[PDB]
Design a protein around this ligand. Structure first.
Ligand SMILES: [Zn+2]
Lengths: 65, 149, 88, 82, 101, 24
RNA sequence: GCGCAAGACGGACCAGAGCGAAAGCAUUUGCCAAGAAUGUUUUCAUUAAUCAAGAACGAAAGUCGGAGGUUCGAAGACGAUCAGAUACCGUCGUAGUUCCGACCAUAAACGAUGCCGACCGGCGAUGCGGCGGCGUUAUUCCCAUGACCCGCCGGGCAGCUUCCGGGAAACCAAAGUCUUUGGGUUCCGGGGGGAGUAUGGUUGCAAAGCUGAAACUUAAAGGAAUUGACGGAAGGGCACCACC
């Protein structure tokens, strides 16, 4: 079924945004490989970035069998 | 692919575009030929001389240095042998396979390989007789072959 | 070998593993390596010793199988054959 | 794909190909200039040498042949020529 | 007409495969064509374990198992319901049956 | 089955070898 | 249960794994000759592809002489089942199965798919050789060397996917690049039977192998796929005119 009053209620639910968005962060964690891409994008002056240490063991596959 | 095998390998040598001797090699043509004569008197075939020179003295190609080939140099000095090296090595292998074959009469597979080897011998002998390298009456004898080797 | 007054005295005669143990050890995607030696002890006993071993999978291995090459198992068998000889 | 530039492949594309299958053939070998730790003479050695190369008078082995590039002994250094 | 791309076998790149005997018939079957099962069972069933531990002189004794490799011909695997028939498309599913669940 | 008919046609030939000879 | 002997056989590890021209090849160690792939700024310089004649090898069975004969087992002798069984089931058991030396040259000898060469889509694995790269492990170190990990290159056995294109379709990355019809070359087919039979020739101790008709007879035989009907094929559901 479809009630337009229920449509209005669900639109009131949909028109919800927090005061502080989820995409404005003081610090954004960035891999060393992404930092070089941003360097190629002349974005080396970004101040919210923080380069992190990548994982060393190159073990990202599922065992076979 | 291979003549007597079903293989289709691709491994070989790739000469560079540079036909020119590099500047760090300071050996003159006459000095390069002197090593050819020296190593020819120790029972070294042209293909052995080439690898010795390459590995030790920095001589990538002698056609690029002296403007000639090793067998031509040896023949001009008179140090070339009677049979060509490729035909010499084919007859040597035929004697070895045939010598193993009297102590092993039930070895049916060496009997196949010997047929293949002697077919290859006949092919090279035909090619060389058309080129007037071997006398026209030369013939490969399965029993007398040891006299050639 | 003897019966000393209601007691019979025994001596070592052989040794072997259990069928359950052996059958549990034999698995598929690995390699089996076996050897046998004949060695005489100092005091005059002649023994035939058999040895078995199996290839092991690694902690981070992704591949299914852990087979060993033929010259790798001829070395292992050579080492089994010499350690059993020197220790008897 | 469907518009790949066959005339001007990048250096990373061509170095990854087989030597015969490149646009122009080129070897993967080189001559390297080896120094014995004890002796003072400096010797040119092929990267894929098949013969045990040794000093003429200093009587020291420089390399041992393997299935690919020859293996230098410990204490011997080298540098590619040009 | 041809039913299976592999001819009902596992033979690829070789000429001859040594035969084996069916466990049920004693029939000669190629080793790559036979239906093989590894059975690891208990010597005593759950109907006898309660009567076995109460008579065991060892505390915490673990009862042994039994390891048998069984080979079937195509006829016995079907008669004994080891292997069923299935639709044309399902025939291409070669994942082991979900028994490990 | 063609195998049996092949076997049958061979016994007939083996017997006709005897009943039809050069000496006849 | 403890020993002794005889011949045969190499389980489990053993895989859509490897090697070989194909038949085919699996306990350890040693000797003998052989081989592919990879590596190569070595050498010769067209030396090549396919092949009438002519040759080498060729499962199993089968034939001649020597040796040995465990097991299994054509023939044969029995006991069952059956309306009948000269069969299927069971008890024996000859030749044979094993080895040495000569013949035989045939298989659903199959990928039912000749060999050599070029072009045409992806993806993950696997076996070998080489090249590069964090990091674990051979216990705490020197480097190489091995066992893992992540990629790249060449040659192999294959797999998944695709509106590459083909095909009667099943299906095939070859069985594609075919009326937009020509890269090279060998063998072989021409509706179904008679018939791979007769006859001649040839090989073989034999059994047989190779080559191989005609008279006559016939309107279809055949290949793929589709709806049913049936199955002494497998799974589910319903009914007090089915059972409990
Ligand atoms: Zn069966």
């Amino acid at each position: 079924i479809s009630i337009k009053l229920q449509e209005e209620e669900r639109e009131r639910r949909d028109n919800y945004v927090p005061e502080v968005s989820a995409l404005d962060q003081e610090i954004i964690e960035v891999d060393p490989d992404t930092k070089e891409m941003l360097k190629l994008l002349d974005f080396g002056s970004l101040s919210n970035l923080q380069v992190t240490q990548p994982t060393v063991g190159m073990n990202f596959k599922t065992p076979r069998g | 692919g291979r003549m007597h095998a079903p293989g289709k390998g691709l491994s070989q040598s790739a000469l560079p575009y540079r036909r020119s001797v590099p500047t760090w090699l300071k050996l003159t043509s006459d000095d390069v030929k002197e090593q050819i004569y020296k190593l020819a008197k120790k029972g070294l075939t042209p293909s052995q001389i080439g690898v010795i020179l390459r590995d030790s003295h920095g001589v990538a190609q002698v056609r690029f240095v002296t403007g000639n080939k090793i067998l031509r140099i040896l023949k001009s000095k008179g140090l070339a042998p009677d049979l060509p090296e490729d035909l010499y090595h084919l007859i040597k292998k035929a004697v070895a396979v045939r010598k193993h074959l009297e102590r092993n009469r039930k070895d049916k597979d060496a009997k196949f390989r010997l047929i293949l080897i002697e077919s290859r011998i006949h092919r090279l002998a035909r090619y060389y007789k058309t080129k007037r390298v071997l006398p026209p009456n030369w013939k490969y004898e399965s029993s007398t072959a040891s006299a050639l080797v | 070998e003897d019966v000393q007054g209601k007691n019979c005295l025994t001596n070592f005669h052989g040794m072997d593993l259990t069928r359950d143990k052996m059958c549990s050890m034999v698995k598929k995607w690995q390699t089996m390596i076996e050897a046998h030696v004949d060695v005489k002890t100092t005091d005059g006993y002649l023994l035939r010793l058999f040895c078995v071993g199996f290839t092991k999978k690694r902690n981070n291995q992704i591949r299914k199988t852990s087979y060993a090459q033929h010259q790798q198992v001829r070395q292992i068998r050579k080492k089994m054959m010499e350690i059993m000889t020197r220790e008897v | 794909p469907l518009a790949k530039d066959l005339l001007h492949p990048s250096p990373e594309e061509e170095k990854r190909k087989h030597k015969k299958k490149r646009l122009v053939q080129s070897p993967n070998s080189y001559f390297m200039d080896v120094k014995c730790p004890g002796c003072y003479k400096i010797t040119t050695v092929f990267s894929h040498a098949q013969t045990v190369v040794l000093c003429v008078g200093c009587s020291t082995v420089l390399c041992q042949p393997t299935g690919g590039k020859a293996r230098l002994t410990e204490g011997c250094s080298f540098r590619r020529k040009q | 007409t041809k039913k299976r791309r592999n001819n009902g076998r596992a033979k690829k790149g070789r000429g001859h495969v040594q035969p084996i005997r069916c466990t049920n018939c004693a029939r000669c079957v190629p080793k790559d064509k036979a239906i093989k099962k590894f059975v690891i069972r208990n010597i005593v069933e759950a109907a006898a374990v309660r009567d076995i531990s109460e008579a065991s002189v060892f505390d915490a004794y673990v009862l042994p198992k039994l390891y048998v490799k069984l080979h079937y011909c195509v006829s016995c695997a079907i008669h004994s319901k080891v292997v069923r028939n299935r639709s044309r498309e399902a025939r291409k599913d070669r994942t082991p049956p979900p028994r490990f669940r | 089955r063609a195998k049996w008919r092949k076997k049958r046609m061979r016994r007939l030939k083996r017997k006709r070898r005897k009943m039809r000879q050069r000496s006849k």
